[PDB]
């Protein structure tokens, strides 16, 4: 799912 640390 979408990460807060590396959202690229």
């Amino acid at each position, epitope marked *: *799912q*979408p*990460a*807060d*640390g*590396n959202p690229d």
Partner: antibody, heavy 124, light 109 residues
């Protein structure tokens, strides 16, 4: 309380495609507060996240496996599934499905419900 | 990716002992850190999420987690025979999510 049921263990031949399905009971798979994922554990080793899916079809893959893996979802039957192409003995492992929640503030994901695990053996 | 390490890789401890396990990330992961307990032949079970919160069915005063950034600890108070298991940390800050290699907790008797 969710219960996640995987299809059972078996053989897959070298270079063919592993296919697994998880059926979710106790709640709808069409939930905007869950993703749904696959994790594996080679015998005697630790755990590796394979990938995940949201109930709309968006998918997220571990780059150590992104070429070979496809995950899909069937909200009508409360199911999601995993296909792993061109397998080798490096793929022999217990495969788990898991529901993926998170703890706000922030998307602090956790794996809160897990299937029982299914042992997949790559062999001739 | 974010490499997780744990120490020690195994330990033995007696019943009633206090046991602490350490998890390290090679990059800060804020509070995005979970602990799982895997007993033999079972799937991992979530014990601690968001570094320090208890999963709601876990009995109080038996497990606690602490830390932030790169260093985290799981503490087992009053070790019991049923706590025999491998304990894994796992980070959720950078994708791909990654698990530590696990710490096996054995019981001395």
């Amino acid at each position: 309380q969710l219960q996640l049921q995987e299809s059972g263990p078996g053989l897959v031949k070298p270079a063919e495609t592993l296919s697994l399905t998880c059926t979710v009971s106790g709640g709808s798979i069409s939930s905007s507060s869950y993703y749904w994922g696959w994790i594996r554990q080679p015998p005697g080793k630790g755990l590796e996240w394979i990938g995940s899916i949201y109930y709309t079809g968006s998918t997220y893959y571990n780059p150590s496996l992104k070429s070979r893996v496809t995950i899909s979802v069937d909200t009508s039957k409360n199911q999601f599934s995993l296909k792993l192409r061109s397998v080798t003995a490096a793929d022999t492992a217990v495969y788990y499905c898991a529901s993926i929640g998170w703890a706000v503030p922030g998307k602090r994901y956790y794996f809160d419900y897990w299937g029982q695990g299914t042992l997949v053996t790559v062999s001739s | 990716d974010i490499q997780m390490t744990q120490s020690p890789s195994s330990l033995s401890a007696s019943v009633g002992d206090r046991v602490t396990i350490t998890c390290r990330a090679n990059h800060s992961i804020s509070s995005y850190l979970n602990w799982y307990q895997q007993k033999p032949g079972k799937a991992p079970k979530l014990l601690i999420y968001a570094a320090s919160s208890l999963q709601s069915g876990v009995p109080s005063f038996r497990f606690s987690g602490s830390g932030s950034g790169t260093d985290f600890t799981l503490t087992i108070s009053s070790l019991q025979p049923e706590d025999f298991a491998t304990y894994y940390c796992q980070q959720s800050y950078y994708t791909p999510w990654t698990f530590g290699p696990g710490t096996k907790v054995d019981i001395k008797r």
